[PDB]
Amino acid sequence: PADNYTVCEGDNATLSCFIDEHVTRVAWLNRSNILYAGNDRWTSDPRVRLLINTPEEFSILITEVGLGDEGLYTCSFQTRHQPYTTQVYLIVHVPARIVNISSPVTVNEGGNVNLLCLAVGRPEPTVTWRQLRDGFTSEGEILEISDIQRGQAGEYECVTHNGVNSAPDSRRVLVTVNYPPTITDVTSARTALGRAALLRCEAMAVPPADFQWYKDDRLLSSGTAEGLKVQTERTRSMLLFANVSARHYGNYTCRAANRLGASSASMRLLR
Amino acid sequence: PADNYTVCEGDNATLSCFIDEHVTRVAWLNRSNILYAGNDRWTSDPRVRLLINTPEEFSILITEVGLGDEGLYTCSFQTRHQPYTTQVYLIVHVPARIVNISSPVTVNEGGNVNLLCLAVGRPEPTVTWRQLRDGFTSEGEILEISDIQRGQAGEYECVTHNGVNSAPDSRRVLVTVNYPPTITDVTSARTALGRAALLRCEAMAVPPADFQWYKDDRLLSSGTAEGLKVQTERTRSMLLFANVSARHYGNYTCRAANRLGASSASMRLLR
Numbered sequence: 292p293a294d295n296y297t298v299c300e301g302d303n304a305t306l307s308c309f310i311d312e313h314v315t316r317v318a319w320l321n322r323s324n325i326l327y328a329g330n331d332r333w334t335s336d337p338r339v340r341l342l343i344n345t346p347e348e349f350s351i352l353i354t355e356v357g358l359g360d361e362g363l364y365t366c367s368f369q370t371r372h373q374p375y376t377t378q379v380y381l382i383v384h385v386p387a388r389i390v391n392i393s394s395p396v397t398v399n400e401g402g403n404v405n406l407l408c409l410a411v412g413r414p415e416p417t418v419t420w421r422q423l424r425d426g427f428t429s430e431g432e433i434l435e436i437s438d439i440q441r442g443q444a445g446e447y448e449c450v451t452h453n454g455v456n457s458a459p460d461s462r463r464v465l466v467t468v469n470y471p472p473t474i475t476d477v478t479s480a481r482t483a484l485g486r487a488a489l490l491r492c493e494a495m496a497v498p499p500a501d502f503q504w505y506k507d508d509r510l511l512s513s514g515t516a517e518g519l520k521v522q523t524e525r526t527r528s529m530l531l532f533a534n535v536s537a538r539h540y541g542n543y544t545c546r547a548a549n550r551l552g553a554s555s556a557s558m559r560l561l562r
Numbered sequence: 563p564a565d566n567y568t569v570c571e572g573d574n575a576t577l578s579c580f581i582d583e584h585v586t587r588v589a590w591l592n593r594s595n596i597l598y599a600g601n602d603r604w605t606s607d608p609r610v611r612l613l614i615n616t617p618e619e620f621s622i623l624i625t626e627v628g629l630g631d632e633g634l635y636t637c638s639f640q641t642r643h644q645p646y647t648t649q650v651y652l653i654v655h656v657p658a659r660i661v662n663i664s665s666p667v668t669v670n671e672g673g674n675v676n677l678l679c680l681a682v683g684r685p686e687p688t689v690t691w692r693q694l695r696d697g698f699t700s701e702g703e704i705l706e707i708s709d710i711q712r713g714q715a716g717e718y719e720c721v722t723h724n725g726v727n728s729a730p731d732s733r734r735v736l737v738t739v740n741y742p743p744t745i746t747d748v749t750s751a752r753t754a755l756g757r758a759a760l761l762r763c764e765a766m767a768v769p770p771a772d773f774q775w776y777k778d779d780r781l782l783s784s785g786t787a788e789g790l791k792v793q794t795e796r797t798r799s800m801l802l803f804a805n806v807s808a809r810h811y812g813n814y815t816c817r818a819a820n821r822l823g824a825s826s827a828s829m830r831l832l833r
């Protein structure tokens with residue numbers, strides 16, 4: 292004979308106590324504490340309000356329910372002959388929400404990464420991790436990634452839910468792995484005299500590779516002297532040749548290096 | 563936080579609740595049922611009466627406490643600011659008392675006797691048997707005596723207690739062993755003529771042995787004829803001879819007999 296009255300936190304709880312005509316006295320109680328005895332306010336809490344005092348039902352109201360309001364409320368009333376009690380157990384449901392999540396982390400390829408997602412809620416919320424680029428789901432507060440590769444990098448989303456009608460409140464974290472440059476594309480030019488030409492290197496790196504060009508032994512300085520100018524991009528570096536020059540012909544090597552490694556390839560310029 | 567108020571069954575229980583001046587409301591509660599709210603009677607039981615309504619203490623009384631009154635009584639009261647509770651747990655003690663005990667028993671020596679002492683009480687009382695004359699104790703509701711002897715006869719006391727502040731209510735039973743008479747002492751007289759003499763026998767028996775005197779063949783009748791008079795006691799019987807007589811000289815036999823046996827010894831009267 293213990294009924295369950297579950298409410299979502301912050302809402303209004305209404306406690307009705309239905310009685311017959313022949314009731315001598317009636318009151319609602321907080322655990323063992325009296326709130327209202329008939330028209331008598333016992334509780335000094337301004338949230339406890341009296342809704343209905345009909346000789347057929349005796350109903351009160353609790354405004355702004357908190358976690359401290361969880362308890363056993365009884366409605367002890369009396370007839371001319373025998374006493375009575377009808378009890379109701381108040382349960383507060385806190386909707387699930389993420390309270391702490393890992394900061395945007397950066398690691399080197401082949402590293403070991405641990406992501407934590409702390410979420411609170413009544414009942415116990417279910418924390419679930421997810422990778423945006425690739426669909427992988429792990430039902431756990433923490434997620435570890437051992438010897439991560441470049442493709443596994445991206446945004447990692449945490450979602451939590453306690454099954455309530457409330458929204459899950461998912462949040463995302465971006466993981467960026469560092470990898471050394473590997474030269475994917477190399478172009479060589481063998482052009483005739485009079486026409487412009489260009490050499491290029493494609494090496495993708497994080498942090499973006501610092502590209503170095505080498506003419507045989509020496510390296511280029513991107514100066515107007517010798518009529519050469521290099522254009523640097525995040526994933527490429529084009530070596531541009533204005534007009535032509537007799538000396539410009541020869542072996543060339545580019546070098547792409549970041550903090551994690553280096554790479555180099557040799558291309559030529561012929562006629 | 564929880565006090566114990568143990569009462570013996572049938573007495574008066576009084577529940578005081580001491581409060582300061584700044585109390586908006588006050589009430590006593592039996593479990594979750596309101597008994598008295600201020601000056602307002604909630605309980606329909608005429609045994610609950612309100613003794614004191616001082617703004618300093620709020621005390622009620624329960625007349626004729628029963629086992630059904632055992633419970634947790636709380637005093638929920640209110641100040642202008644916060645509620646309060648001071649609780650009291652009612653405990654009923656049934657005092658130990660003997661309801662059945664053995665009647666005064668009689669047995670023959672070497673017999674087997676069983677004495678039972680049935681005692682009631684909550685909690686379960688501890689029954690202990692005891693021998694009054696000689697210190698012997700048996701911690702058991704029943705006491706058995708194998709091959710009962712003469713010295714073991716006497717009063718056997720039963721005592722029971724439940725540890726309460728109540729009295730032990732001890733009772734006694736008398737055990738009387740019957741034993742046949744065994745003649746312990748016999749005296750013969752060899753007196754001269756003119757002087758008085760006496761014969762006696764000592765045989766203790768229960769029930770007291772009926773002593774018989776025999777002069778040679780015949781038996782004495784304690785008559786003034788022949789000048790003889792016998793004095794019989796519980797443990798002895800003296801055969802008294804006043805002055806002398808020629809016929810008085812000769813063999814004599816005494817006999818002590820009860821319900822369990824007889825005994826006889828031969829003494830003489832010489833010159």
Ligand SMILES: *[C@@H]1O[C@H](CO)[C@@H](O[C@@H]2O[C@H](CO)[C@@H](O)[C@H](O)[C@H]2NC(C)=O)[C@H](O)[C@H]1NC(C)=O
Pocket residue numbers: 321322324357358359360361362363381644645
């Ligand atoms: C019954 O009344 C007591 C009064 O102390 C409540 O206890 C406090 O309630 C408030 C608000 O809910 C909390 O902030 C406090 O932490 C609680 N404890 C104390 C020591 O003040 C109790 O919650 C009430 N019970 C119900 C079911 O309403």
Ligand SMILES: *[C@@H]1O[C@H](CO)[C@@H](O)[C@H](O)[C@H]1NC(C)=O
Pocket residue numbers: 293294295
């Ligand atoms: C009330 O809630 C408790 C705790 O979840 C549960 O054990 C019980 O079965 C519930 N009763 C009802 C009637 O829902």
Ligand SMILES: *[C@@H]1O[C@H](CO)[C@@H](O)[C@H](O)[C@H]1NC(C)=O
Pocket residue numbers: 302303354
């Ligand atoms: C709760 O009651 C207050 C008081 O009337 C009202 O303003 C509020 O809108 C109510 N909220 C809900 C969710 O019932």
Ligand SMILES: *[C@@H]1O[C@H](CO)[C@@H](O)[C@H](O)[C@H]1NC(C)=O
Pocket residue numbers: 518533534535
């Ligand atoms: C390229 O050739 C044009 C035409 O002959 C000339 O005007 C210009 O100066 C040359 N520039 C370079 C960098 O050689």
Ligand SMILES: *[C@@H]1O[C@H](CO)[C@@H](O)[C@H](O)[C@H]1NC(C)=O
Pocket residue numbers: 507541542559
């Ligand atoms: C330059 O390239 C040519 C042709 O590929 C090669 O023969 C020569 O060894 C390279 N190096 C130098 C310094 O000329």
Ligand SMILES: *[C@@H]1O[C@H](CO)[C@@H](O)[C@H](O)[C@H]1NC(C)=O
Pocket residue numbers: 563564565566
């Ligand atoms: C009441 O009795 C229990 C049981 O022994 C004890 O733990 C508690 O301290 C007692 N309370 C008081 C106020 O004596």
Ligand SMILES: *[C@@H]1O[C@H](CO)[C@@H](O)[C@H](O)[C@H]1NC(C)=O
Pocket residue numbers: 573574625626
């Ligand atoms: C106990 O309660 C009875 C109830 O009738 C009352 O008459 C009596 O005065 C009370 N006090 C004592 C000491 O018996």
Ligand SMILES: *[C@@H]1O[C@H](CO)[C@@H](O)[C@H](O)[C@H]1NC(C)=O
Pocket residue numbers: 592593595607610624630631632633
């Ligand atoms: C107290 O409550 C119990 C249980 O409901 C009930 O049996 C008893 O009669 C009530 N009154 C007293 C004085 O114990």
